[PDB]
Amino acid sequence: DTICIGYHANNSTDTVDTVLEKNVTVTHSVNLLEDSHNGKLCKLKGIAPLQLGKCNIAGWLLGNPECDLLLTASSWSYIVETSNSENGTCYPGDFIDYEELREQLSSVSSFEKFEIFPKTSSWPNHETTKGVTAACSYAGASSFYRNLLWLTKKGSSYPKLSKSYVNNKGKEVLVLWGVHHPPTGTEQQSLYQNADAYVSVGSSKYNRRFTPEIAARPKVRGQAGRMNYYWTLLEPGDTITFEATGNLIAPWYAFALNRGSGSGIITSDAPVHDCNTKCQTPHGAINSSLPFQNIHPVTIGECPKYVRSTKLRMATGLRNIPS
Amino acid sequence: GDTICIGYHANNSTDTVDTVLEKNVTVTHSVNLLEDSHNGKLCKLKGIAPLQLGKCNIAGWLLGNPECDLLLTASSWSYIVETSNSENGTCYPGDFIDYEELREQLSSVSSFEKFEIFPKTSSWPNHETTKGVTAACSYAGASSFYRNLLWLTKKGSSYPKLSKSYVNNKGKEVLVLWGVHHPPTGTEQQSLYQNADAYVSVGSSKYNRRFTPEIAARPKVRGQAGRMNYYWTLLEPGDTITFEATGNLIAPWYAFALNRGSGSGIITSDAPVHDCNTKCQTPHGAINSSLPFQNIHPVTIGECPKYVRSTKLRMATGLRNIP
Amino acid sequence: PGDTICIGYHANNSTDTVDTVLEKNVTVTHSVNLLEDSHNGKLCKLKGIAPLQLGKCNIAGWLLGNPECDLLLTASSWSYIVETSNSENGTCYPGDFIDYEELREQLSSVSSFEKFEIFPKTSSWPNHETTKGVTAACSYAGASSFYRNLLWLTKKGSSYPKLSKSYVNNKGKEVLVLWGVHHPPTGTEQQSLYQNADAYVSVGSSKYNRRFTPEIAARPKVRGQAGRMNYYWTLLEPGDTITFEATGNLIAPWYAFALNRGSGSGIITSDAPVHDCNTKCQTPHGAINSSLPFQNIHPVTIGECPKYVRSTKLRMATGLRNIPS
Amino acid sequence: GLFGAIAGFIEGGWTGMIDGWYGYHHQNEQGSGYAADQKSTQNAIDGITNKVNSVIEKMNTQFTAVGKEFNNLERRIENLNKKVDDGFLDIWTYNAELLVLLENERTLDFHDSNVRNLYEKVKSQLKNNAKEIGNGCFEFYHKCDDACMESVRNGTYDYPKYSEESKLNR
Amino acid sequence: GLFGAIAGFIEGGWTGMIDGWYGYHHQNEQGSGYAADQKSTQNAIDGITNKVNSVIEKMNTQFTAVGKEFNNLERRIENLNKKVDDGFLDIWTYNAELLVLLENERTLDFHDSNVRNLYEKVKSQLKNNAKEIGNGCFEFYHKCDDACMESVRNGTYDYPKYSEESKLNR
Amino acid sequence: GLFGAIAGFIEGGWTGMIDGWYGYHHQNEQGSGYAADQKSTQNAIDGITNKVNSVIEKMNTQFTAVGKEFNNLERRIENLNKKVDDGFLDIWTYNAELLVLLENERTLDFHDSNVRNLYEKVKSQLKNNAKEIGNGCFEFYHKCDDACMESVRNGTYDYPKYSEESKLNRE
Ligand SMILES: *[C@@H]1O[C@H](CO)[C@@H](O[C@@H]2O[C@H](CO)[C@@H](O[C@@H]3O[C@H](CO[C@H]4O[C@H](CO)[C@@H](O)[C@H](O)[C@@H]4O)[C@@H](O)[C@H](O[C@H]4O[C@H](CO)[C@@H](O)[C@H](O)[C@@H]4O)[C@@H]3O)[C@H](O)[C@H]2NC(C)=O)[C@H](O)[C@H]1NC(C)=O
Ligand SMILES: *[C@@H]1O[C@H](CO)[C@@H](O[C@@H]2O[C@H](CO)[C@@H](O[C@@H]3O[C@H](CO)[C@@H](O)[C@H](O[C@H]4O[C@H](CO)[C@@H](O)[C@H](O)[C@@H]4O)[C@@H]3O)[C@H](O)[C@H]2NC(C)=O)[C@H](O)[C@H]1NC(C)=O
Ligand SMILES: *[C@@H]1O[C@H](CO)[C@@H](O[C@@H]2O[C@H](CO)[C@@H](O[C@@H]3O[C@H](CO)[C@@H](O)[C@H](O)[C@@H]3O)[C@H](O)[C@H]2NC(C)=O)[C@H](O)[C@H]1NC(C)=O
Ligand SMILES: *[C@@H]1O[C@H](CO)[C@@H](O)[C@H](O)[C@H]1NC(C)=O
Ligand SMILES: *[C@@H]1O[C@H](CO)[C@@H](O)[C@H](O)[C@H]1NC(C)=O
Ligand SMILES: *[C@@H]1O[C@H](CO)[C@@H](O)[C@H](O)[C@H]1NC(C)=O
Ligand SMILES: *[C@@H]1O[C@H](CO)[C@@H](O)[C@H](O)[C@H]1NC(C)=O
Ligand SMILES: *[C@@H]1O[C@H](CO)[C@@H](O)[C@H](O)[C@H]1NC(C)=O
């Protein structure tokens, strides 16, 4: 009579690497590396992302006339730019501290847009109806940004304007404006009358003064002039005051901001869908409890840690020796 | 029958360790690698006490905000302490240019000699030196001003051009601070400085600026629609700094000859200062430990154990305990 | 008294030692060193291309064309750029080289260029003075001189009319354009040089746009000059145009550089001698020739190198404990 | 390989034994059969389950991480941000891969150890009441019915009881 | 455990043996007692001391490290600074916790091995002059006085000396 | 060591066995000599080669890395850059040193294990046809000439063939 000691074998074809030898077949193992996603852009906390489409952040917040679909946007789980996100500033110029504004937006989960300076009643002594350009066309006609107002001389006079807004919204307000720089002194005169024009913007914390920089530049979208774009975050209770004798592209609409965490701006050409996820990448969503993933380093939500690995399989059972 | 048995030690230890295969293993001996104790006090390093800013911050100290008078004598420290109430900084509203860089500079200063760079009573014979006070900087019931700067105004109905240089003969870097005032109106400009169109210029071997007042009413802060910007520079040994102005200069009065040292820093803490000594300081308290790790605070001054998020790091030295 | 067989293991005369967790300095029969600590003490070619030796010049002196840096006027291609501890010729006229550190960062991915006369001196400036812009601060060979790659324009007669001058980039690659802005110490010198008290310089391309206005301040002499000059640069993209407009104070581009981008280059500081050898891996102390994973020679490396660590030894046991006894 | 049992003095595994990782094959008059060892297997299961949960537990999930943008005059801080991201990624990739390699070696050796310990356990129960073959098998010097076998498996084998019978046959 | 001695074929430890980690308990006609094994315990103490010191020595101390301040237009670099601090903190917490986990496993197994090897050393000294009980104990076939016992403890047991007596009784 | 053989019950190594890591010394009427065990030696060489290569493979090479410069008003970012460079250097130095320490231990133990398993392999082949001395040696209870020895070395020793001769001499 006999008794033997022995160990399990099965038909497992799972392999793992060890330090002394590669590709060892084991009876059981577990994969620690997620390499699968659903190829879509989903909701988080059941909230849909904001798809900018052919627009970028600048085109959205300024209201580039190509971005009118976004006018209604007010809340999102994250923001999506695409490979075709080219509509931003349609009048050439510099968007001052643009990358910083993008970083700010990354912690904004919603806003309420409102008419900070109503076009019809804010500017009785200035022309509000002629500030359009072929650089920002819409429907084959010269136009302009929807959230800013290009003020010009009424008749032959641009009197000193002074306009203030007090922030009674109970939260931060994002105010955007521009300053225009004609290419010639006669153009400065046509638009604004005053050769020695200035723009001054002040709040409790912001304080800047701008003067026209008149010079011929290479034409960009037909324009030898430039417009620089500016922004500030006005704190609850604070006031912002504009004073100008020309060259002000005035705020028309502004944005009362709601801060939230875990949001962000991603770049992706993946389709938006009605599904819901805990973890989103620019390639697609992940539904996994595995500790690692090799899908993408950019993530929104709660995700496995990105690593460059192709295989992370941990042995749990033993060397498989079925002979 | 006659016998010998081979065996191992057991004792009354209740020390437990974690291993890969099993948690909370009781072992006969062990060493804790994790420091979790501190004395709750801010202590001296190398026998030198920290500088307690108290209700002031770094700006309030270097400018001499009138609420900061207890610091007027401070000359050397081991590290600098701000508190949750370090609120007194710039009392007249405006921007302190490169303020964060100045804080970083002061982080490698271990002492200084404060000196009267431009004595108030003898430096400014053609200008008014006694009227430069403001309700924005009130102290003890009266309008006042920074102790280390001097607000020059017109003498009678005249503010003639001033020109003033200082040569650095201190044998080390000198920190010089000044301001430029921007009134809210032409009326106040003329009232303070007489000259409607004024400037301030500052030049050294490395610094070069002409400042022009920017006259505009901003929202009132601390009762002021005007603004004052604050500037600073480090003057190298042998170099000269030259100030010229026809108005709007908040002149240096006191400057600081800097001694550089390493291993210093600024921390924020509400813990009390005491006459104790340590080699390692955190914002929660001092640490006296030769252990490799601590979970007390990531901010440390001196020679400290490495900060980790762990609650337990216990290394087995003896064996499994089986009594 | 029977036949016998014993089981045993190798010993030899190896003296190699390794450290282990439980025991230091264990002698083993075989082992492999993973830490490279040897170099040849020279600066070598990479891909068979020599480095550019700035010598007594620095990158500012090279690009602006400090007259002391004339031996570099012919440099056109390199594998990396070498500054030394005596690289002191740069901005001979005192002032600030704006975004200089950014320019240095850009140059780290430039492997060659073609210098060209962007605005020829003799024909570009018919209404301004082109021959009086020399200074004792930039003296060469016994005489007042100036940067080779810029041109200090001043007033002709009693007038400095508005200039406007453009260059279209037809080079098929990025063109690095440098210029300067002079800041006299007094309003009087402003008038004597440029006539216009209210002068400006504007520079614009499709993407770049900046206005410069003299900042006139009394200030000390540096290299004999109370004036200052600020130096500026921009990268003009293929097909784009740059336009200079000024009513004074412009130190105009004269020569500019069409750049060729290349990866894995950079700027190092080393006093080691350049030699006619080739390497895959260069550090400031010398070149490395090694297939080892780690090195403790220098954290700065150019090419394809082992990883820098502070270790003084990394020796893996491969054989067993050596017990010859 | 470390403990000499798996792929060693016990040359091969048993596809016939499906209810556990380690166990016994017995053969007597009353029949033959496979029987997993509940205790050894279960201790191996708790151990490995703990190993895996511990590996996973040390790995913080990743919360929102997205790109930053930089303008054409911020190339140094752009390159710094890139040095930071690439450096952390190199380290985590290294840590993940190395932890799996080393732990896999340890896991296979652990199973080897468990088999070996089970073998020596049985060998100490039986002593001279059986002889060792060299391949994980013992031949008894007495009749061991399924009751006896069972005793051997659950560690209650009574040696003295059969010591005389075995001494005789032996 | 990996080597099968501690909490293994030697069920438990000895609160009675206070002067070392490993040793012996004997009973003869002269009396009983515990005695630590100097050689074994000491080698274990040197090894463990070295392991602890190596761990500590690889963790170079933290020198002054404080927060940085950033203005309201420096959010990108403030966030970069935070990413760097958190990232290094993740890595060091991971490395510390993991090193202690893995080394603790190794230390326990080192001890287990030290006990196994001690038992095997005695076993090959005694050969068939004693019978193995199986619980870590040997019963001699001859009289083994205090001097004989001491020779077993210090590795100089004279097998031939007692082979004849033992055969007789065996 | 962990497995008790090297510097253990087999007290020292053999400078006379030059062609392998583990092996045999025999003595019989025909003569004496050393012979490496090819199977165990080659298995160890393969393992160790794989270990070294796996170590190197996880160390992707360093491409061009040159210093960044900062102006006098960029001290915070200069210091951030230094914190990053120092932090990564601390980590990589730590990983390289520790990996070599731990793996060196594992490697020596692997050798100790291979010697122990070779010894136990021979022991179980021979059984009671030889007596264990205790120092890694076996004395045969039967004559074992060169062909017989080679059968022990290549793992084909025939215990039953020599059992009767052995039993006569053992008693
Ligand atoms: C929303 O975003 C879209 C996409 O970016 C913009 O559409 C582009 O507008 C630009 C600017 O006008 C167009 O670029 C221009 O193209 C002219 C001709 O382009 C050729 O190729 C296109 C596409 O293949 C053809 O449709 C076209 O018939 C031509 O064959 C050039 O003449 C222009 O060059 C001149 O001006 C530029 C300065 O801007 C100079 O640098 C040049 O040297 C030269 O003097 C110019 O490059 C582009 O074609 C449009 N693309 C598309 C896909 O439509 C929208 O305008 C934008 N809308 C708003 C309001 O933001
Ligand atoms: C030293 O620091 C202390 C503590 O920070 C500081 O005392 C504080 O001063 C301010 C004075 O502005 C006080 O806050 C004010 O409270 C009044 C009364 O309720 C408000 O009306 C004020 O708001 C008006 O003005 C604001 C602009 O400044 C407007 O935004 C607002 O709409 C109103 O018009 C203002 O909030 C605060 O109460 C005290 N706190 C204490 C503890 O005394 C002190 O002034 C500092 N001193 C110096 C010289 O630096
Ligand atoms: C090229 O670089 C060299 C080396 O730096 C420059 O030469 C140096 O020029 C400085 C400034 O003129 C000299 O320092 C000065 O010396 C005089 C006394 O002789 C003193 O009065 C000044 O205050 C200052 O200390 C320095 O001596 C001189 N060194 C050498 C080695 O000659 C040179 O000017 C540079 N040339 C150009 C065109 O960039
Ligand atoms: C192994 O067995 C399963 C069922 O237990 C069977 O479905 C499968 O085809 C087999 N797999 C392999 C790899 O042989
Ligand atoms: C994700 O997978 C789990 C289990 O695989 C499942 O229960 C859950 O419904 C899935 N969630 C989504 C959103 O796909
Ligand atoms: C444990 O044992 C030691 C040694 O006998 C003794 O000093 C100590 O007081 C004991 N501690 C406890 C908690 O029993
Ligand atoms: C060690 O051996 C090598 C050849 O194997 C020989 O060349 C060298 O001289 C020897 N060294 C000693 C210690 O004699
Ligand atoms: C092993 O040794 C025997 C006896 O010397 C020999 O005849 C046989 O061919 C060998 N087998 C192998 C593995 O080559």
Residue numbers in the entry:
A (entry chain C): 11 to 54, 54A, 55 to 83, 83A, 84 to 95, 95A, 96 to 125, 125A, ...
B (entry chain A): 10 to 54, 54A, 55 to 83, 83A, 84 to 95, 95A, 96 to 125, 125A, ...
C (entry chain E): 9 to 54, 54A, 55 to 83, 83A, 84 to 95, 95A, 96 to 125, 125A, ...
D (entry chain D), E (entry chain B): 1 to 170
F (entry chain F): 1 to 171
Per the authors:
The hemagglutinin (HA) protein of influenza viruses binds to sialic acid receptors on host cells and is the major target of neutralizing antibodies. In a previous study, we described five naturally occurring human mAbs that potently inhibit the 1918 H1N1 pandemic influenza virus. One notable difference between these two antibodies, however, is that mAb 1F1 not only inhibits the 1918 H1N1 virus, but also 1943 as well as select 1947 and 1977 human H1N1 viruses. A greater understanding of the basis for such broadly cross-reactive antibodies may suggest novel vaccine or therapeutic approaches to influenza virus infection. This study provides a detailed characterization of one such antibody, 1F1, and highlights common, emerging properties of cross-reactive anti-head antibodies.
